Amino acid sequence: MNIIEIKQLNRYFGEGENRVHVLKDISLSIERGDFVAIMGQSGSGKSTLMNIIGCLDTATGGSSKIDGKETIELTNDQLSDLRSQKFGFIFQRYNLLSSLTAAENVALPAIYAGMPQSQRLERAKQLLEKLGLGDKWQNKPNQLSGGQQQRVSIARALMNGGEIILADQPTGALDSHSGENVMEILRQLHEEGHTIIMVTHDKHIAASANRIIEIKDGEIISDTQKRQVKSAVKNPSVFKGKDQLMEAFRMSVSAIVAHKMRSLLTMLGIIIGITSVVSVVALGNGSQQKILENIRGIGTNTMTINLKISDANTLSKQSYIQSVTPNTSSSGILVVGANLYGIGEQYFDVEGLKLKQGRLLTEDDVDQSNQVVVLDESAKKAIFANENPLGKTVIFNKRPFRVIGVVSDQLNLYSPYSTVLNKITGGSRIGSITVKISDDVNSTVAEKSLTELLKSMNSDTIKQTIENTTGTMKLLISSIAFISLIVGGIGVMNIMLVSVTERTKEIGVRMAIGARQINILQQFLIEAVLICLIGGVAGILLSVLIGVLFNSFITDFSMDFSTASIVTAVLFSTLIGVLFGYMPAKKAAELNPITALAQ
Amino acid sequence: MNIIEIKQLNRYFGEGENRVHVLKDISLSIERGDFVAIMGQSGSGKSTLMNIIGCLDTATGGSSKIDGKETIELTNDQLSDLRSQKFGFIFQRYNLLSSLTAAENVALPAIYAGMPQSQRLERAKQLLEKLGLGDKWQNKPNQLSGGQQQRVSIARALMNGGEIILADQPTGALDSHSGENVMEILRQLHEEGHTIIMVTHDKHIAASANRIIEIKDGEIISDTQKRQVKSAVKNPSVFSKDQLMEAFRMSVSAIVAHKMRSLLTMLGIIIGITSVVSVVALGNGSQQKILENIRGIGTNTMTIFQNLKISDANTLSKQSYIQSVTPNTANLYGIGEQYFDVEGLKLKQGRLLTEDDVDQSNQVVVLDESAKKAIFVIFNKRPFRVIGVVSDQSLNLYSPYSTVLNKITGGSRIGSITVKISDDVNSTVAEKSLTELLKSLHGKKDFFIMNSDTIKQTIENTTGTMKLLISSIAFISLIVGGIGVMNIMLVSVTERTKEIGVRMAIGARQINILQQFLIEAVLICLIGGVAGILLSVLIGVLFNSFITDFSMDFSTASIVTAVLFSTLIGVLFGYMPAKKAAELNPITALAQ
Numbered sequence A: 001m002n003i004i005e006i007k008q009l010n011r012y013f014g015e016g017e018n019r020v021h022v023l024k025d026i027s028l029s030i031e032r033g034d035f036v037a038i039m040g041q042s043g044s045g046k047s048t049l050m051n052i053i054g055c056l057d058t059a060t061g062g063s064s065k066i067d068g069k070e071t072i073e074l075t076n077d078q079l080s081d082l083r084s085q086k087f088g089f090i091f092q093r094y095n096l097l098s099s100l101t102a103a104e105n106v107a108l109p110a111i112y113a114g115m116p117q118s119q120r121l122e123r124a125k126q127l128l129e130k131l132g133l134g135d136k137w138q139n140k141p142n143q144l145s146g147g148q149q150q151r152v153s154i155a156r157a158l159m160n161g162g163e164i165i166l167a168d169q170p171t172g173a174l175d176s177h178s179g180e181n182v183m184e185i186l187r188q189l190h191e192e193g194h195t196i197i198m199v200t201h202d203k204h205i206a207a208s209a210n211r212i213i214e215i216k217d218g219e220i221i222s223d224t225q226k227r228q229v230k231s232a233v234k235n236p237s238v239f240k241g242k243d244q245l246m247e248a249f250r251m252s253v254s255a256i257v258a259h260k261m262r263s264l265l266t267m268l269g270i271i272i273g274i275t276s277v278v279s280v281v282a283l284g285n286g287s288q289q290k291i292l293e294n295i296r297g298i299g300t301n302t303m304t305i306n307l308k309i310s311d312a313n314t315l316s317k318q319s320y321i322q323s324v325t326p327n328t329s330s331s332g333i334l335v336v337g338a339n340l341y342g343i344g345e346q347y348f349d350v351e352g353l354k355l356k357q358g359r360l361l362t363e364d365d366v367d368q369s370n371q372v373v374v375l376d377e378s379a380k381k382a383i384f385a386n387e388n389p390l391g392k393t394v395i396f397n398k399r400p401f402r403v404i405g406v407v408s409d410q411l412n413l414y415s416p417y418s419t420v421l422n423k424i425t426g427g428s429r430i431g432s433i434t435v436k437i438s439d440d441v442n443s444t445v446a447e448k449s450l451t452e453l454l455k456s457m458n459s460d461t462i463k464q465t466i467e468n469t470t471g472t473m474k475l476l477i478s479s480i481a482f483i484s485l486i487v488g489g490i491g492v493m494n495i496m497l498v499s500v501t502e503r504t505k506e507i508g509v510r511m512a513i514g515a516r517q518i519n520i521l522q523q524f525l526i527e528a529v530l531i532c533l534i535g536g537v538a539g540i541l542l543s544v545l546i547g548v549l550f551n552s553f554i555t556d557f558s559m560d561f562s563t564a565s566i567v568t569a570v571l572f573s574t575l576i577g578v579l580f581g582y583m584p585a586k587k588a589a590e591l592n593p594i595t596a597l598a599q
Numbered sequence B: 001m002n003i004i005e006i007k008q009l010n011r012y013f014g015e016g017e018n019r020v021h022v023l024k025d026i027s028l029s030i031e032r033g034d035f036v037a038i039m040g041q042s043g044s045g046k047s048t049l050m051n052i053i054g055c056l057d058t059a060t061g062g063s064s065k066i067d068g069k070e071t072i073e074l075t076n077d078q079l080s081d082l083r084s085q086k087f088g089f090i091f092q093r094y095n096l097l098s099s100l101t102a103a104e105n106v107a108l109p110a111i112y113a114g115m116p117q118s119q120r121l122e123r124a125k126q127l128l129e130k131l132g133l134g135d136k137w138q139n140k141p142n143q144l145s146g147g148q149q150q151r152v153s154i155a156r157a158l159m160n161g162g163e164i165i166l167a168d169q170p171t172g173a174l175d176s177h178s179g180e181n182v183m184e185i186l187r188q189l190h191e192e193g194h195t196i197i198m199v200t201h202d203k204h205i206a207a208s209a210n211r212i213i214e215i216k217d218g219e220i221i222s223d224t225q226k227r228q229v230k231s232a233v234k235n236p237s238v239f240s241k242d243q244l245m246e247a248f249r250m251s252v253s254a255i256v257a258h259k260m261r262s263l264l265t266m267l268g269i270i271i272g273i274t275s276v277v278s279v280v281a282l283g284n285g286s287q288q289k290i291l292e293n294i295r296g297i298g299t300n301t302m303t304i305f306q307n308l309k310i311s312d313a314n315t316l317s318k319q320s321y322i323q324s325v326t327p328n329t330a331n332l333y334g335i336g337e338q339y340f341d342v343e344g345l346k347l348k349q350g351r352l353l354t355e356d357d358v359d360q361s362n363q364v365v366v367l368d369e370s371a372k373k374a375i376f377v378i379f380n381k382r383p384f385r386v387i388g389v390v391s392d393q394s395l396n397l398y399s400p401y402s403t404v405l406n407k408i409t410g411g412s413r414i415g416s417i418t419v420k421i422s423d424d425v426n427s428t429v430a431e432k433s434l435t436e437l438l439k440s441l442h443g444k445k446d447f448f449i450m451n452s453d454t455i456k457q458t459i460e461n462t463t464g465t466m467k468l469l470i471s472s473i474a475f476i477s478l479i480v481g482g483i484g485v486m487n488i489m490l491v492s493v494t495e496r497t498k499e500i501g502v503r504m505a506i507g508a509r510q511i512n513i514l515q516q517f518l519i520e521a522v523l524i525c526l527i528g529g530v531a532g533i534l535l536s537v538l539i540g541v542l543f544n545s546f547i548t549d550f551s552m553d554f555s556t557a558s559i560v561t562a563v564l565f566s567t568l569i570g571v572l573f574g575y576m577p578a579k580k581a582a583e584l585n586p587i588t589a590l591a592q
């Protein structure tokens, strides 16, 4: 029977007293196949009605039925089907996409329908040929006159060959010639079985119509028909219960290339949120190595202890003891022109004394009980003043000694324990045994692991301030990485929330021309991940370049990276940049297109 | 004679092959006061010519003279004057500011003309009345139908009473009633001496013009005059505190109109401050605890290992770069008054050697923690009364030097003198300052100075590492937040380049733009700044309360640096784009 059935349709805008009655109990039925022209004074509710017909708005009250199916009760996907294939809409203000070409803007509604890309541009190019724009098929909207942009919008509405053709003032900016051709086009579509509902003010245009309604003050005044209307059985239906993503991907790349700034800035906000978190973790762990190393080098940790060399020999065969020293001293007199410490092979490693000049007590010296002495930094300057002491001799208890090297501090003389127990004091008993406990093993554990291992005192203030300042450096690195991470995240959020919501109009258009709710989320997720995992890649390998640059010029300490921070910094900056690139696009795609088109 | 003289005027668009010839050697002299209607096929160059006449575009070649004065040769403020007082422009696409009410949009061009605010709204409301929109004066453009929007535009163009009214299809989206009413307005203004140039496709509209020109493919085909033009009398030429007080009011509304943009940008600088400050203060705090953990491992001393008198040490202790001094001579260490402060040894139980013991050569000994636990005295068949114990760091015993040189060994010559070098004085400076200070006393030798200062080394060595740390992560976190503002800022203002093109076409001067865009920055900069300096404060309070370890010790140099950097950068990027737009041709600014 009818194709559109409106009854008791009311419409309101505003809050009240700021509220206005815009469509008042208007009841209208349009007969399938008609050519209806709507006329009225500016701001009388015409466009408001057209939107509720084309499923871009939703009336406050009353019924509206397309092919007898109540529109409000349809589902969201069902409604999108109507806007894609039943309705072809010519927007008053032409509502193109400013980044797409003429042809691209025409074929857009056909992508969500689902025809091959090759078929689209040829048709879109032909629609522009009919409407006199074949010369300008590549120009973008802002490279076209208003009248041309209008005809572009016309071609779009005819791209999917929709049954109904809602045309809100489709001639407004067109000359008589261009305008007549458009009416030639619309007439021939009426003649081929199409339904036309056209708002206009030009009477010559309204002449091409069979029926002419007049609206005024939200109510319907006139109703005129020249002829009766041929009958027509309704078309079958347009309801659709992989390639969809191939297209979504192509759209998202183009979009990204179109908005070079927004895109570049966005990925650049992700780039930093990664490298900043990564560079402080690696600068933090780098300055912790040096600081702890500078503390370990201020002295060692040792455990001074029937104690024969075979005890200190097996003591050195552990992995929780890295060096050992048998000990024995002597108090006598020296001569050139005191204390002679009888020490072990590794004593200069057990106490951290470092070699200044010459060499230290080798293994041959302790085996043969050599009469060789290593001098203390102090006792070396006092005896020899500023002259080289290497080789020259000293006399301890009328017994020669050949100076072989100098060491640092914490008169003192260091000779083997075999030479003090054979050539200075005699006897076989030694004073004590000293061991250098490893840096990793626990302190109080070894103090009881040596009591056990020998039966079969210790100084550890460095080993304390090490563990004490490693807990401090932890809290520092840990709490500045947390800042930089929360910083760079809110950095992505801000630039993502802005650059996305700044295209809520674009969704409103896409929804008006057929796209389904999911079609939007597809290309906006693809837009995010595609811009986030390129910013991510650029991120992990921009901090690399920074490390190299740093480790090259900087000498104090090195920037050592942590693959945990890399992961955490990337998986966080993208998990947050994708969430805020999706959330806004979704909230827009679920708005009534006209409410999305008024932003 | 002529109010508009256009000769040889050409115009192109694009880059060959993408280049098009749009206006082709068109010469057209319009007589002052006339009423002209231009017609032609869609895209024949009508809007282009219209923009050139109104000083919104500029021709590739050929002349174009308003009141005989060449246009290109005019200054950027002389044009801005024309657009405000010579031309009233009705834009084909109506080009309203979405965030302004219907009345606000119409009065706008009167700001940059300098009219009181109470008079603007009353006239704007009246103009809307004359166009039938007095019912909707509060409505924002998206709360209006296309036609209504068109009439708001018409109203705006007539706000400054410009002599020339460049109407580009003023009646396209209007019924005949409204359209004719608009024609009644234009027809009367013509009577009152206004010049009218009107682009249209309606012929009934064109009839109401004495002169009718038809353009096709960029050339002029038709030129028809019904009656001769009424003789013309040339009109007079038309060429900061308030100006700014208005721009401020524009900035505040602009900010409140873009709540998200604003809250996000000011949040962008809030972080750029809190981060920089919170890392400078987390670092300086941990440094204190680390440098303290190192200083507590030992002191720094310079032992002057005969000719060594107690008056030497007595004068040595009277410096500010020396904090304590000690004469020095089983083991019984004849030591001085402050020896337990020189080496850092601290008191366990009992007491230390007082000034009465060393003065009286008392026979009292302070025991080492190791030599105290093993035994529990008589040193060389000479009693000694124990009095205390110390911090360990053979058997060690501590007695006065006066007791060892009198009751144990004899002799008046001591062993050495140990001084405790201060924490702030440089080391190698003191090693050469004591060689001088004591040499002035002439008591040399010895002066064979030792210096144990590895602690004083491994603080300067780690303070140089902690410096490079806090200094390079404060540079990161600063560069980070600085770009974070640039991003959010460089978008937010490029987002409104068209708003500028509107303001520039409708009268504003270049400077007028920079005024309200700077005030938009500084006003949003120094609020997020305040929000930043005191949000970091609250973070410190939260950190110092729950964390026992190192306290977050702030710096009043990073506070300044962070703020003055996050604003100077947010201001530089709120201005740079706004200024680059306001110097484009208004049409090129309107196409974005």
Ligand SMILES: Nc1ncnc2c1ncn2[C@@H]1O[C@H](COP(=O)(O)OP(=O)(O)OP(=O)(O)O)[C@@H](O)[C@H]1O
Pocket: A136, A142, A143, A144, A145, A146, A147, A148, A173, A174, B013, B014, B020, B022, B040, B041, B042, B043, B044, B045, B046, B047, B048, B049, B092
């Ligand atoms: N940026 C551009 N790049 C290339 N060509 C352009 C550009 N802008 C406009 N053009 C072309 O130059 C011509 C100028 O059109 P103009 O703006 O004068 O439209 P018009 O004559 O007012 O048409 P209508 O009557 O439809 O409004 C058009 O044919 C258009 O295709």
Ligand SMILES: Nc1ncnc2c1ncn2[C@@H]1O[C@H](COP(=O)(O)OP(=O)(O)OP(=O)(O)O)[C@@H](O)[C@H]1O
Pocket: A013, A014, A020, A022, A040, A041, A042, A043, A044, A045, A046, A047, A048, A049, A092, B136, B139, B142, B143, B144, B145, B146, B147, B148, B173, B174, B175
């Ligand atoms: N968001 C809104 N808030 C308040 N009022 C609104 C809103 N949107 C539209 N209106 C009002 O609803 C009415 C309907 O406008 P509509 O767009 O239908 O006009 P129209 O019939 O298309 O006229 P034109 O020929 O000018 O396009 C107008 O009077 C307008 O002021």
Ligand SMILES: [Mg+2]
Pocket: A046, A047, A092, A168, B145, B146, B147
């Ligand atoms: Mg309308």
Ligand SMILES: [Mg+2]
Pocket: A145, A146, A147, B046, B047, B092, B168, B169
């Ligand atoms: Mg035009």
